Design a protein around this ligand. Structure first.
Ligand SMILES: Nc1ncnc2c1ncn2[C@@H]1O[C@H](COP(=O)(O)OP(=O)(O)OC[C@H]2O[C@@H](O)[C@H](O)[C@@H]2O)[C@@H](O)[C@H]1O
Ligand SMILES: Nc1ncnc2c1ncn2[C@@H]1O[C@H](COP(=O)(O)OP(=O)(O)OC[C@H]2O[C@@H](O)[C@H](O)[C@@H]2O)[C@@H](O)[C@H]1O
Lengths: 202, 205
């Protein structure tokens, strides 16, 4: 498939245009064109924010999924409401493993203790403007135990847990009611492998 | 008065107030800071919360599908941001382009099919619109399936920056499973296609 590699690109320099909580960097490079020749110098504004771990809580016995509801204002301008239905997720820090961030966030966000876990897919959200990569895991859970609303809330992570059938959640994806990349991808994956996973677990 | 719209979540836009958006950095792509308050599930109202959001516009995505030959037309192109976490910055993607003012998702998809892959799309069909990573970017991408004759492979206009690859639907999907195609729009598009190919082929028969 892909011909070219890292030796076919010369990164001239990287510069931080802005550095706050996240970073906005500028990549200046030259690369091979699809005719051999090397291009001129190209500039790219790249959003640097680290990488994420995602966990799809799936109850094989009940054939259910556990969703996380929390506000995401970046969704404001193009959605009817900023509050989205999502998967458990968290940023991967200094040498943490994807599985551990996923399992830890399952406790913090949904109050669930994941049992067996399995790798699904790893994707780049939008490779044209950000370096962010998200790695999905499917974790065996007991929907029956998820937490409820926090009396005293975490204001930068106020979550409401939703438990729904596997089919329901998938239909919402097709209907557009669930439309964040991690959820759409994980839920489509589940829809293509649910019987094999149900047979493997329990 | 008319009844309120239905929501699959607890709160709507009337439950959140945006104090302001200040520009942290300005370029054709910008990084802004949203300052806002919102109702909490416990029934109270939050203190000001601040978020850095990547403003980069929105994209139109086209999945080139030949239902008769059961093939898919991919596009190879360099994505430098994929560099630090990928074996090669050259990815296999879907036809895609930025949506401009007064342009529909379909018009962009159709225009992009021609200049990126030299394809002329016939019937189109909405697939899905998704938020790439809503916690830090506002970017929204709308996908469509474009009926195409895979034999119309092409050189295109941007053949020096983009190379087309015509493959079977099954090979495309197998590459998604193996991690050989891992960019969001392509993964979502191809999984949707693996779930609907028969109905779509019957429809476009
Ligand atoms: N970070 C950037 N900085 C400067 N120029 C850019 C950038 N991103 C794209 N461009 C330039 O513009 C051309 C394409 O611009 P767009 O219209 O934005 O289309 P595309 O780059 O393919 O973005 C669409 C697809 O990639 C994902 O990032 C996004 O989620 C969408 O699925 C490219 O050839 C490239 O040279
Ligand atoms: N835009 C932002 N600006 C400033 N602080 C932020 C922002 N986003 C998150 N934070 C801070 O970091 C914490 C979030 O940590 P994580 O749990 O790691 O982030 P998360 O919200 O889960 O975002 C990762 C998930 O959302 C998508 O953007 C991404 O694809 C991934 O699936 C929050 O408590 C908040 O204080």
């Amino acid at each position: 498939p892909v011909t070219f590699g890292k030796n076919d690109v010369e990164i001239i320099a990287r510069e931080t245009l802005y550095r706050g909580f996240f970073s906005l960097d500028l990549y200046r490079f030259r690369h091979r064109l699809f005719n051999g020749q090397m291009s001129h110098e190209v500039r790219r504004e790249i959003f640097e924010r680290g990488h994420a771990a995602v966990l799809l809580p799936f109850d094989p016995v009940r054939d259910e999924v556990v969703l996380i509801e929390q506000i995401r204002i970046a969704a404001y301008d193009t959605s009817e409401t900023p509050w989205l239905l999502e998967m458990v997720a968290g940023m991967i820090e200094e040498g943490e493993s994807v599985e551990d961030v996923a399992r830890r966030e399952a406790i913090e966000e949904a109050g669930l203790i994941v049992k067996r876990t399995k790798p699904v897919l790893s994707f780049l959200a939008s490779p044209g403007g950000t370096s962010e990569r998200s790695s999905i895991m499917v974790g065996e859970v007991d929907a029956t135990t998820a937490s409820g609303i926090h009396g005293l809330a975490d204001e930068n992570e106020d979550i409401r847990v939703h438990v729904v059938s596997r089919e329901q959640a998938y239909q919402w994806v097709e209907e557009g009611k669930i439309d964040n990349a991690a959820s759409v991808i994980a839920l489509q994956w589940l829809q293509l492998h649910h019987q094999a996973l149900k047979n493997e677990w329990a």
